């Protein structure tokens, strides 16, 4: 509540030796201070004798400490190279980039008229700023709000005025309205035009929408699947007048995409998400209700669509369970694989009418999921050599409806070609030692014998597989192949050398390097990725890593930095589950596999992130299949796995009391009929019934 | 809540008593055993409970220890459990020499 | 009022002007009152409707915010009195 | 003073560094002493180690007198029984 220091933004000189002391900063440095409990916008260039003891002293001192040494490592030393000057400055540059975006406001939450100390009352708006979550939204008065972001305020009024809440939706519960085949693209697609395989998809979802049945979207990995739902959401809203708060659950990795995908393909319905913690938890509820608390279920209704991470489902299962929902969206719904899932019966409690999964999950790996999917969409509904025809007579005829199978043979005609090459790498020197000795406890127990015990099975069928191509995944390996006792050339050479795969990768990489292709590395193991992190920097190739350990904000920054027109790094390394998590790469052509991902198809999506509709540079894929190892066999089982892949009466006096006041306020009100009804002023009656009453009422008047 | 001097001291104690959850985590402990158990024999396996059970034993074993330790500690004009306070306790029980 | 501003000031409402025509001076009202303030007052109803005045007073665009007091004048009726008089006046209603 | 393809992997589940110190104090207060010495709590784990071995010693023995790979929880019980710390609740 007090005026105290919150953070550091910017640092500059105040006044016209070897190391600046703190005094120098006090008598020769001015620092931009952001104040506590107050938006970014009011930042002051202040010193220490200027403010004196103010609550909060800690961050400036250290930051100055960081500053003092920083000064000794840019201008005040001759061990500094060319490149460190680039980073030490660079930080100044990026530290401000993450500070600039807070000044631009992004949404106005509410508007309160609060009194001042001069006896005046001024309007204030709860303002939300860019790429930040709902917390630290402070009140700012309206004087300059439109004076910097007119567009936000224009839109701020529009939603409040656009009476289209879940308050007027048509009763089609009992039975439906006959629905129509669309030819044309709906006058609700501002994002552009779609094609001849995105409007029909939509016409099936909406086509079994009117049946009372739910369906499975099973298309290829990225055939404008997201556009088909958003448009599916859009046409179920201005078609059958459904204001029904639609619930959508998507991955924490793939939502930011969705939002923009939702706010650019369909302006007029607003999209408020759920991605906070403790504080947010409250702000969601601020706008999730009207008029504070509410008897019964009499919430006036201020949203329709939401996006939920999978976490958050389970953390607050209860509140959603109570509120009614009749339409469901989920992203990459191969989650419901087993029928013992926690989200598997978590979803069943949410009073629901129609569902909508949309993933390319292959449905022959196990028959469990094939059944689980069928049991989940439709609770209740469900081999022999010569009965197989009898069997698919039952399975083909029944499964199809709630299924979609459609090949690329679309939009791929423009997109440059797809390709994948295997790699037979035979074993090395130090390699056999630990391919041979490890399958016993001979020299595996002499060196690291205490650990031998726990990894002994790990190493057999879930390591040898993983530690067959590369033995560098334990401790007593690094110096084993390096034959000497600081060297820089040798370490680089010693590490490239041990593996069949490291050399093969180093040369191909070089081979395309001079030709110009952007290369991708998908590794199964977290560490491999540091391993390379250590080597590629050394040999000077600009890169960034994509692990399982990164904040949403940080994940998002680089993904974009990469697909921008003029980005230097053609090397990008990714995960199997963390890599194929979600996202798309449109600049990339080449993708290389170190080891198969203990399974058929984790790779098939793994290449899906790079091989998408956009890519204009064909495609290239390399699989490093190890020889005379254990990699070979799974590769064969993997094959075994993927072998199959298949009127309201009349107007009463009180309304007549309602209509009369509205005329004194708005004059002729025949034009404004729906806006008033959406909000309190009018009951739902047909447009004419009011209009005639409006006219006779003056006719009586004259 | 009165002032602040020795205010929590007795507070946490009470809340901990009403509860009945494991004092020590159930993840570090799990390996600690696996790791020594190897030194006395090879190729080991573990029942889910077996550890659960050890945790129970051990935790309970220590508390008990501390419980005396406390007394000893009191005897001494002190409210501080000490490195030895531990020893006497054990010595007189007899595992400690 | 909806008709005249629509056919001369369409693209931008606020430029709306009185010119010569003279509507009464309001000397003793608590705050600065001058023809420009009336100019906005009318646009304000043109935008929000008669009788909602907090709407009008708060608007960032109008700039009327600390000249309204809904002992301090003019309050809600004072404006109510203000518009009926101006609207009739410029069409020639008081004939 | 080099990146040198550096990879860092160190061990903190099982090993005593890894385990949590509050996990102990959590334990200390149930007894309800006011103060914890730094020296002391280190010793305490020390003893835990001493108690823990002997049991497993026996455990291991009963697992092995029967030629079994899976260690039974009963196996632990008898162990405790031998030192006179038998546990009700388990494995009648
Ligand atoms: N049917 C479509 N019509 C027009 N543009 C599309 C269509 N589908 C996708 N796009 C464009 O391609 C990009 C990614 O879409 P898509 O490939 O479906 O997402 P994902 O990476 O989930 O597959 C988007 O940025 C979008 O502009
Ligand atoms: F169809 Be996607 F990978 F969001």
DSSP structure string for A130-175: TTS-STT--EEETTTHHHH-HHHHHHHHHHHHS--STTS----SSS
Is the CB of residue A374 less than 8 Å from the CB of residue A381? yes
Sheet holding A44-46, edge to edge: A5-13, A29-35, A44-46
Q: B24, D52: Cβ pair inside 8 Å? A: no
Buried b (16+ CB within 10 A) or exposed e, A130-140: eeebbeebeeb
Chain C residues touching A105 at Cβ < 8 A: none
Q: How was this structure determined?
A: cryo-EM
Q: Could you give the CA distance from residue A414 to residue A628 in angstroms, rounded to a whole number?
A: 41
A395: left (phi over 0), alpha (psi -120 to 50) or beta: alpha
Is residue A200 a known part of a binding site? no
Is the CB of residue A586 less than 8 Å from the CB of residue A560? no
Q: Could you give the CA distance from residue A517 to residue A619 in angstroms, rounded to a whole number?
A: 10
Q: Could you give the CA distance from residue A258 to residue A278 in angstroms, rounded to a whole number?
A: 24
Q: Could you give the CA distance from residue A299 to residue A548 in angstroms, rounded to a whole number?
A: 40
A212: left (phi over 0), alpha (psi -120 to 50) or beta: left
In A, minimum Cα distance to D6 occurs at A534
**Segments of A298-445 assigned E as strands:** 306-308, 328-331, 356-358, 421-425
Q: What number of other Cβ atoms are within 10 A of residue A649's Cβ?
A: 7
Q: A531, D7: Cβ pair inside 8 Å? A: yes
Residue A104, SS3? Answer: coil
A251: left (phi over 0), alpha (psi -120 to 50) or beta: beta
Q: How far is CA A311 from CA A278, A306, A373, A702, B80, in A?
A: 14, 15, 21, 66, 44
Q: How far is CA A262 from CA A105, A216, A257, A427, in A?
A: 19, 21, 8, 51
Q: A317: Cβ–Cβ under 8 A, 6 or more apart, which residues?
A: A346, A349
Q: Could you give the CA distance from residue B84 to residue C51 in angstroms, rounded to a whole number?
A: 84
- Rg, Å, chain C Cα set: 13
Q: Could you give the CA distance from residue A611 to residue A600 in angstroms, rounded to a whole number?
A: 17
Residue A374, SS3? Answer: helix
Residue A221 CA: nearest ligand 1 atom is: 23
Burial class (CB in 10 A: 0-12, 13-18, 19+), A479: exposed
What is the whole-number distance in angstroms between the Cα of residue A199 and the centre of ligand 2?
18
Q: Could you give the CA distance from residue A97 to residue A489 in angstroms, rounded to a whole number?
A: 37
Q: Could you give the CA distance from residue A457 to residue A460 in angstroms, rounded to a whole number?
A: 5
Q: Could you give the CA distance from residue A353 to residue B79 in angstroms, rounded to a whole number?
A: 64
Is the CB of residue A274 less than 8 Å from the CB of residue A309? yes
Name the one residue in this structure whose structure tokens are 């025949």: A670
Sheet holding A121-129, edge to edge: A105-115, A121-129, A139-141
- If residue A311 lies in a helix (H) or strand (E), which one and from where to where? helix A310-315
Q: B79, D35: Cβ pair inside 8 Å? A: yes
Nearest C-alpha of chain A: how many angstroms from C55?
Answer: 10
For the record, the structure tokens of A99 come out as 């500070």
| Touching chains D and B? (3+ Cβ pairs < 8 A) | yes
- If residue A545 lies in a helix (H) or strand (E), which one and from where to where? strand A543-545
Residue A470, SS3? Answer: coil
| Touching chains C and D? (3+ Cβ pairs < 8 A) | no
The DSSP letter of residue A571 is E
Q: Could you give the CA distance from residue A19 to residue A575 in angstroms, rounded to a whole number?
A: 44
Nearest C-alpha of chain C: how many angstroms from A289?
Answer: 23
Burial class (CB in 10 A: 0-12, 13-18, 19+), C86: middle
Q: C52: Cβ–Cβ under 8 A, 6 or more apart, which residues?
A: A665
What are the two backbone dihedrals, phi and then psi, of residue A274, each rounded to the nearest 5 degrees? -130, 100
Burial class (CB in 10 A: 0-12, 13-18, 19+), A78: exposed
Q: Could you give the CA distance from residue C41 to residue C80 in angstroms, rounded to a whole number?
A: 11
Residue A222 CA: nearest ligand 2 atom is: 1
Q: Could you give the CA distance from residue A203 to residue A183 in angstroms, rounded to a whole number?
A: 9
What are the two backbone dihedrals, phi and then psi, of residue C41, each rounded to the nearest 5 degrees? -50, -45
Name the one residue in this structure whose structure tokens are 């088909």: A228
A178: Cα separation from own chain's centroid: 37
Q: Smallest Cα–Cα separation from A223: which of A206, A198, A251?
A: A198
Resolution for this model in angstroms, one decimal place? 10.0
Q: Could you give the CA distance from residue A639 to residue A651 in angstroms, rounded to a whole number?
A: 71
Sheet holding A356-358, edge to edge: A215-217, A356-358, A328-331, A247-249, A306-308
Q: Smallest Cα–Cα separation from A358: which of A251, A259, A271, A244?
A: A251
Q: How far is CA A402 from CA A169, A230, A647, in A?
A: 27, 19, 38
Q: Could you give the CA distance from residue A397 to residue A394 in angstroms, rounded to a whole number?
A: 6
Strand partners, A519: A571, A590
- If residue A375 lies in a helix (H) or strand (E), which one and from where to where? helix A367-377
Q: Give the DSSP letter string of D41-84.
A: HHHHHHHHHHHHHHHHHHHHHHHHHTT-SSPPHHHHHHHHHHHT
Nearest by CB to residue B59, choosing from D14, D27, D60, is D27
- If residue A448 lies in a helix (H) or strand (E), which one and from where to where? none
Q: What number of other Cβ atoms are within 10 A of residue A283's Cβ?
A: 18
Residue A582 CA: nearest ligand 2 atom is: 3
Chain A residues touching D2 at Cβ < 8 A: 486, 488, 491
In C, minimum Cα distance to A153 occurs at C60
Ligand 2 atom 2, closest CA? A222
Q: How far is CA D77 from CA A247, A388, B49, D45, in A?
A: 52, 54, 12, 22
Q: Could you say which ligand is closest to the alpha carbon of residue A254?
A: 2
| Touching chains A and C? (3+ Cβ pairs < 8 A) | yes
For the record, the structure tokens of A641 come out as 């796995």
Residue A45, SS3? Answer: strand
CATH topology assigned to domain D9-92? Histone, subunit A (1.10.20)
Q: Which of A196, A222, A579 to mutate to test the pocket of ligand 1 (most atoms within 8 A of CB)?
A: A222
- If residue A485 lies in a helix (H) or strand (E), which one and from where to where? none
Q: How far is CA A565 from CA A560, A569, A587, A588, A589, in A?
A: 10, 11, 8, 12, 14
Q: Smallest Cα–Cα separation from C41: which of C21, C16, C7, C9?
A: C16
Strand partners, A215: A356
A4: Cα separation from own chain's centroid: 35
For the record, the structure tokens of A123 come out as 């309007």
Strand partners, A544: A572
Strand partners, A620: A590
Alpha helix (H) residue ranges in A576-620: 602-606
A297: Cα separation from own chain's centroid: 32
Q: Could you say which ligand is closest to the alpha carbon of residue A222?
A: 1
Residue A124, SS3? Answer: strand
Alpha helix (H) residue ranges in A444-484: 449-461, 478-481
For the record, the structure tokens of D60 come out as 């291991």
- Half-sphere exposure (CA, 13 Å, Cβ side) for B91? 8
The DSSP letter of residue A382 is -
- If residue A48 lies in a helix (H) or strand (E), which one and from where to where? helix A48-51
Rounded to 10 degrees, what is the CA torsion of D67, D72, D78, D79? 80
Q: Smallest Cα–Cα separation from A16: which of A28, A32, A30, A31?
A: A28
Q: How far is CA A533 from CA A537, A538, A545, in A?
A: 7, 9, 8
**Segments of A405-547 assigned E as strands:** 421-425, 519-522, 543-545
Q: B47, D12: Cβ pair inside 8 Å? A: no
For the record, the structure tokens of B51 come out as 């550890």
Q: Could you give the CA distance from residue A618 to residue A416 in angstroms, rounded to a whole number?
A: 4
Measured CA angle at A479 (ends A477, A480), to 5 deg: 55
Residue A204, SS3? Answer: helix
For the record, the structure tokens of B34 come out as 């696996």
What are the two backbone dihedrals, phi and then psi, of residue A505, each rounded to the nearest 5 degrees? -65, -40
Q: Could you give the CA distance from residue C68 to residue C58 in angstroms, rounded to a whole number?
A: 9
Q: D27, B23: Cβ pair inside 8 Å? A: yes
Q: Smallest Cα–Cα separation from A272: which of A123, A106, A142, A111?
A: A106
């Amino acid at each position: 509540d007090f005026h105290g220091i919150d953070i550091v933004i910017n640092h500059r000189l105040k006044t016209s030796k070897t190391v600046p002391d703190l005094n120098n900063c006090k008598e020769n440095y001015e620092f931009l201070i952001k104040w506590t409990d107050e938006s970014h916008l009011h930042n002051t260039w202040e010193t220490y004798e200027s403010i004196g003891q103010v609550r909060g002293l800690k961050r400036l001192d250290n930051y100055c400490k960081q500053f003092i040494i920083e000064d000794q490592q840019v201008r005040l030393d001759p061990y500094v190279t060319a490149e460190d000057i680039e980073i030490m400055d660079m930080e100044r540059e990026r530290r401000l980039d993450e500070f600039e975006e807070f000044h631009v406001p992004e949404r106005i939450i509410d508007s309160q008229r609060a009194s001042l100390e001069d006896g005046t009352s001024q309007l204030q708006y709860l303002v939300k700023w860019r790429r930040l979550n709902y917390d630290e939204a402070t009140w700012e008065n309206a004087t300059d709000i439109v004076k910097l972001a007119p567009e936000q305020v224009k839109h701020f009024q529009n939603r409040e005025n656009s009476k289209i809440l879940p308050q007027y939706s048509s009763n089609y519960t009992s039975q439906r309205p006959r629905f129509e085949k669309l030819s044309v693209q709906p006058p609700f697609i501002k994002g552009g035009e779609l094609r001849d395989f995105q409007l029909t998809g939509i016409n099936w979802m909406a086509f079994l929408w009117s049946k009372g049945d739910n369906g499975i979207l099973a298309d290829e990995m990225g055939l404008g699947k997201t556009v088909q739902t958003v448009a599916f959401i859009s046409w179920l809203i201005f078609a059958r007048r459904q204001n029904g708060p639609h619930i959508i659950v998507v991955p924490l990795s793939t939502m930011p995409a969705w939002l923009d995908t939702f706010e650019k393909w369909a302006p007029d319905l607003n999209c408020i998400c759920y991605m906070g913690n403790q504080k947010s938890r409250d702000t969601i509820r601020e706008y999730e209700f009207y008029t504070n608390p509410r008897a019964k279920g009499k919430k006036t209704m201020k949203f329709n669509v939401l996006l939920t991470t999978y976490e958050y489902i389970l953390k607050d299962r209860a509140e959603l369970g109570s509120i009614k929902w009749q339409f469901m969206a989920v992203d990459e719904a191969h989650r419901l694989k087993n029928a013992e899932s926690s989200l598997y019966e978590s979803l069943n409690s949410f009073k629901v009418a129609n569902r909508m999964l949309i993933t390319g999950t292959p449905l022959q790996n196990n028959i469990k999921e094939l059944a689980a999917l069928v049991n989940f969409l439709m609770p209740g509904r469900f081999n022999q050599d010569e009965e197989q025809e009898e069997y698919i007579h039952d399975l083909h005829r029944r499964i199809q409806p709630f299924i979609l199978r459609r090949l690329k043979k679309d939009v791929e005609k423009s997109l440059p070609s797809k390709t994948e090459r295997i790699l037979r790498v035979e074993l090395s020197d130090v390699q056999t030692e630990y391919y041979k000795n490890i399958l016993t406890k001979n020299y595996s127990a002499l060196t690291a014998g205490a650990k031998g015990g726990h990894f002994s099975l790990l190493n057999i069928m879930n390591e040898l597989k993983k530690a067959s191509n590369h033995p560098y995944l334990f401790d007593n390996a690094e110096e084993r192949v390096l034959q000497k006792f600081m060297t820089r050339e040798n370490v680089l050479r010693g590490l490239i050398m041990s593996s069949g795969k490291m050399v093969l990768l180093d040369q191909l990489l070089t081979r395309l390097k001079k030709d110009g292709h952007r290369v991708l590395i998908f590794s199964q193991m977290v560490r491999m990725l540091d391993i390379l992190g250590d080597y590629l920097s050394i040999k000077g190739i600009n890169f960034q890593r994509l692990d399982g350990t990164v904040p949403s904000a940080q994940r998002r920054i680089s993904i974009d930095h990469f697909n921008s027109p003029d980005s230097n790094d053609f090397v990008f390394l990714l995960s199997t589950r963390a890599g194929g998590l979600g996202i798309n790469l449109m600049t990339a052509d080449t993708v290389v596999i170190f080891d198969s991902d203990w399974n058929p198809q984790a790779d098939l999506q793994a290449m899906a992130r790079a091989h998408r509709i956009g890519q204009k540079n064909h495609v290239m894929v390399y699989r490093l299949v190890s020889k005379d190892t254990v990699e070979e066999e799974v590769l064969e089982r993997a094959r075994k796995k993927m072998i199959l892949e298949y009127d309201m009466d009349s107007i009463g006096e009180s309304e007549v009391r309602a209509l009369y006041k509205a005329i004194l306020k708005f004059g002729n009100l025949k034009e404004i009929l729906d806006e008033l009804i959406a909000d309190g002023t009018l009951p739902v009656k047909s447009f004419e019934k009011y209009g005639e009453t409006y006219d006779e009422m003056m006719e009586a008047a004259k | 809540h009165r002032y602040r001097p020795g205010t929590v001291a007795l507070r946490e104690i009470r809340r901990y008593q009403k509860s009945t959850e494991l004092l020590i985590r159930k993840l570090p402990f799990q390996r600690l055993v696996r790791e020594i158990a190897q030194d006395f024999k090879t190729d080991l396996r573990f029942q889910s409970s077996a550890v659960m059970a050890l945790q129970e034993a051990s935790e309970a074993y220590l508390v008990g220890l501390f419980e005396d330790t406390n007394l000893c500690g009191i005897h001494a004009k002190r409210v501080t459990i000490m490195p030895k306070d531990i020893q006497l306790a054990r010595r007189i029980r007899g595992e400690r020499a | 009022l909806k008709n005249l501003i629509n056919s001369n000031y369409k693209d931008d409402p606020l430029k709306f002007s009185l010119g010569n025509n003279t509507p009464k001076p309001v000397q003793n009202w608590s705050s600065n009152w001058t023809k420009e303030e009336d100019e906005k007052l009318l646009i304000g109803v043109f935008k929000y409707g008669y009788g909602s005045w907090t709407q009008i007073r708060d608007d960032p665009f109008l700039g009327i915010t600390d000249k309204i007091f809904l002992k301090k004048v003019p309050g809600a009726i004072h404006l109510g009195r203000r518009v009926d008089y101006l609207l009739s006046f410029l069409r020639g209603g008081l004939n | 003073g080099k990146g040198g393809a550096k990879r860092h992997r160190k061990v903190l589940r099982d090993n005593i560094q890894g385990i949590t110190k509050p996990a102990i104090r959590r334990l200390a207060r149930r007894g309800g002493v006011k103060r914890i010495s730094g020296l002391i709590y280190e010793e305490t784990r020390g003893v835990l180690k001493v108690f823990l071995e002997n049991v497993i010693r026996d455990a291991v023995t009963y697992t092995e007198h029967a030629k079994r790979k899976t260690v039974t929880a009963m196996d632990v019980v008898y162990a405790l029984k031998r030192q006179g710390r038998t546990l009700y609740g388990f494995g009648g």
